[PDB]
Each structure stands twice: as structure tokens, then as C-alpha cells.
Amino acid sequence: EVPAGLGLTAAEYAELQPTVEAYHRYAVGPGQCSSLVAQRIEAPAAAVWAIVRRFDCPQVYKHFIRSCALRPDPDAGDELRPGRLREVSVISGLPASTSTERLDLLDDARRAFGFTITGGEHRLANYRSVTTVSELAPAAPAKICTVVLESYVVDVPEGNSEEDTRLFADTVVRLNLQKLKSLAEANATSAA
Ligand SMILES: CC1=CC(=O)CC(C)(C)[C@@]1(O)/C=C/C(C)=C\C(=O)O
């Protein structure tokens, strides 16, 4: 029952399906499309999640982001609560110059993250994203495998097709996850 084109095996998806059925699901309207991307990372689940949970600094693992600035505190000092907004700057030439994104879900216990795009300069509208970090622990002593799942839903512009939009989003998402992998694996190598 593994969704087509995912990148995860049957044994792996069987464990992750509760996390898939809980955090990654969407109601897709005629002018919308959704997708789900998986990334395997060889690194502890805490290290990967520690990078992902930082809403203030997405430019660390996110490929096309030159700089980012977080909006000042509406009465929350030490912790980033859901409802916070950030303003993201993107490299030149891309469909988007800049984006304003809001924190939707941050759960440290269940290791789930999410955010929505409100406004800015870009073609993609109403982009909702959910990122979960999951640990697959072998009963016998094997290497560490952490699986990151990131799903989204987005509106398709009237001039753009569904593939062209989805291919673009999948591309950005995977470059983000490949960087997160590269980063967390280099950090997990030096520590022990
Ligand atoms: C790099 C870039 C180019 C655009 O045209 C749209 C937008 C500004 C939203 C974007 O930041 C896309 C970000 C995506 C798809 C996922 C994310 O970051 O989690």
C-alpha cells in the first residue's frame, strides 16, 4: 500500500503510515495539488529535528534562501509558538523575490513541523507544508536511519499546469531535504 513514486520500501512505509495518515493528508480542490516527499538521513532523530524545528533560520538547510528575518515577538520571549510570522528572501531570477510565511505546527514531542505562506511575491499561493522527523529503530544493532517526510498542498495558477507547479515544488523540497541530509550527516559524523 506504498504510494507510487515515494522512495520508501514496504517495510519502511508500514511503520511510517500512522505518521503519514496523521500529519500528511490534504483536501485537494480543483485548483490545487498536493505531494509527499521522503528523505532518508543517517543521523540521530534529534539532530535532524533540531535543524528543522528552527523557524527563525530556514536559510540554513533551505537551498534557494539567501536571507531571512523573523517578525518581532507578540508576547512570547523564549519559545517559538505557532502563529509567528517570518519574511523570507529568495535568490534573484526565480519566480519569487520574497515570501511571508507563518508558523502553523511546532511539536517537539511528536517531532512535527508546519507552516503556511500568506503573501509576498510568488506564483504559488496558499502553500501549506508539514514536515515530520521519524526514527526507524532496528531490534538488532544496525546503523541509524531517520526518515523525514515533507508534504504540501498548493494552488495551481491559471496559466501554469499541475505538473509544472508540482515538479517545481518537489524540486525545491528535495533540494532542501538533500541539504538537511548533507548537513545532519556531517554533524553526526564529527560528534561521536
Ligand atoms: C524557493 C522558493 C521559490 C518560489 O518561487 C516560491 C517560494 C518563495 C515559496 C519558495 O521559497 C518555495 C519554497 C518551497 C516549495 C518549500 C519550503 O521552503 O518549505
Numbering used by the authors: 11 to 202
Sentences from the paper on this structure:
However, owing to genetic redundancy of the ABA receptors, how the ABA signal is perceived and transduced has been debated for a long time until a breakthrough in 2009 when a novel family of proteins containing steroidogenic acute regulatory protein (StAR)-related lipid-transfer (START) domain was discovered as ABA receptors. ABA-induced interaction of PYLs with PP2Cs releases the inhibitory effect of PP2Cs on SnRK2 protein kinases, resulting in the activation of SnRK2s and phosphorylation of the downstream targets such as ABF transcription factors. In this study, we identified several candidate genes for ABA receptors in the turfgrass Festuca elata and Zoysia japonica, and then we confirmed that one of the candidate receptors, named FePYR1, functions as an ABA receptor through crystal structure and biochemical analyses.
We attempted to crystalize the three ABA receptor proteins, and found that only the FePYR1-ABA complex generated high-quality and diffractable crystals. The ABA-bound FePYR1 appeared as a trimeric form arranged about 120° from each other in an asymmetric unit of the P42212 space group. Although FePYR1 has the highest sequence identity with AtPYR1, FePYR1 displayed a monomeric form in solution which is different from the dimeric AtPYR1. The electron density map shows that ABA is tethered in the 428.0 Å3 of protein cavity with its hydrocarbon chain and cyclohexene ring fitting closely into the hydrophobic pocket of FePYR1. The terminal carboxylate of ABA is anchored in the bottom of the cavity of FePYR1 by an interaction between the positively charged inward-pointing K72 side chain with the negatively charged carboxyl group of ABA. Based on the structural statistics of FePYR1-ABA and published data, E160 and N186 are assumed to form water-mediated hydrogen bonds with the acid head group of ABA. Figure 3B shows that the mono-methyl group on the cyclohexene ring fits into a narrow hydrophobic pocket formed by residues F74, I75, V100, L104, F178, and V182, while the dimethyl group fits into a larger pocket formed by A106, S109, I127 and H132.
